[PDB]
């Protein structure tokens, strides 16, 4: 629907911005670190810790690059009208 | 700012979690990153952590936290 369209236009919007700061990337590894040691995150294949150490400064990047939100919802199916 | 910046973007992904085009839409997004650089020469492999984790992390936006709870309580606010 157009409001599924203009939820993604809105979260990778404020993604490519909060990406920018060093306090969101810090937020969500302190947050991940405690996660990791609770059910069922402690018990899964690959490890949790790993999982974060190596994926979460590559996602950061990712939404530091030059993206149009309008175009990278539409591209990926949640703008079906356009 | 940074702190309503985080409640904003932690409400709407409880919202677009609950959606099937959402997650089917991610999914098919990192299964085709999942082949191209530096994604493919990562360990632990790209498409078992999308295999593993994607489904939890869905799981876990649908019904376990809230925003001010969540950025109050991780620094943004």
């Given at each position: ?39 069922p995150w402690?018990l899964l294949w690959p490890r949790c ?34």
């Open positions: 629907a157009n409001d599924l369209c203009q939820e993604c236009e809105d979260i990778v919007h404020l993604l490519t911005k909060m990406t920018k700061e060093d306090a969101f990337q810090e937020a969500i590894r302190k947050f991940w670190e405690q996660e990791c040691d609770i059910l402690k810790r790993q999982v974060l150490d190596v994926y979460l400064p590559l996602w950061i990047d990712y939404f530091q690059s030059q993206i149009n939100p309008k175009a990278w919802c539409n591209h990926w199916g949640l703008c079906p009208r356009g």
